[PDB]
Write a protein that binds this ligand. Sequence first.
Ligand SMILES: O=C(Nc1cccc(C(F)(F)F)c1)C1CCN(c2ncnc3[nH]cnc23)CC1
Ligand SMILES: [Zn+2]
Length: 289
Amino acid sequence: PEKIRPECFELLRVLGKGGYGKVFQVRKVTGANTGKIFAMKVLKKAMIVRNAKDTAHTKAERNILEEVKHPFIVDLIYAFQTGGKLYLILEYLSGGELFMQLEREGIFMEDTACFYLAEISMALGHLHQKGIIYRDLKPENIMLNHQGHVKLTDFGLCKESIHDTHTFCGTIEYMAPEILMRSGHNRAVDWWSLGALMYDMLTGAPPFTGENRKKTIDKILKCKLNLPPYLTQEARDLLKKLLKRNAASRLGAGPGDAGEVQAHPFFRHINWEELLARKVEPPFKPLLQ
Ligand SMILES: O=C(Nc1cccc(C(F)(F)F)c1)C1CCN(c2ncnc3[nH]cnc23)CC1
Ligand SMILES: [Zn+2]
């Protein structure tokens, strides 16, 4: 049996740092996967007990996450606790954030947006089946692997550096009204957020923005959707079906879940079997760019 220790990993570079802890790119230097590169998160258990909402919740989420096998969800490989720290060993993802692609491109062609949103919808469908709600599809929460395919990566504890309960840490621009109102929610919040992300991809900004936090929340709650005249009929129709205040009435909120969204005419050109098999050419290939 292999004894996993922090000493099994050499540190290569820092990928992130915050109040809860720190993320490293690492190389495993002993055991079966000697030489393989991973992402290693190191969380301060002392900090976790302090800043929290429900550790049982986030623990259960990571418990499920560890067992998930899906091409568009991050692989949480090992998890162990020694010292006063929690170590999470994940697959290393070299393609950067979807945020970075949007920053570069300004806005996406509809075919580009369609590709990413399609892969994301399959990840969401799988998550819901396994009992996970993603909550927040801000483009920083979606990474790309070396090929340019989506990996959902933001689970469990709040990874923000500047905090605020952790609902309002970081941008709330992609989160459903009922999360912000703390009025109770379910997987329908994910289809809202997919819509907010789609809107950002196609127009350059999330749907509801304010000069400050208070005004932004007010706009999200009012949910007065402004549909740009320059987007296709299919894009506008999907957006109006996702970005609805009535959570129950969102496309995807019914019993078919992701199947409802995937059937929409906006995705008419997607071959879902090829997409899942990652046989569809991504719009952007990190290794080549
Ligand atoms: O966790 C992160 N940031 C962060 C920021 C502050 C604090 C903390 C914490 F306390 F949790 F440790 C974490 C990001 C997660 C996604 N990232 C990955 N980068 C590369 N391979 C990856 N494989 C899986 N994820 C990635 C980049 C960083
Ligand atoms: Zn926080």
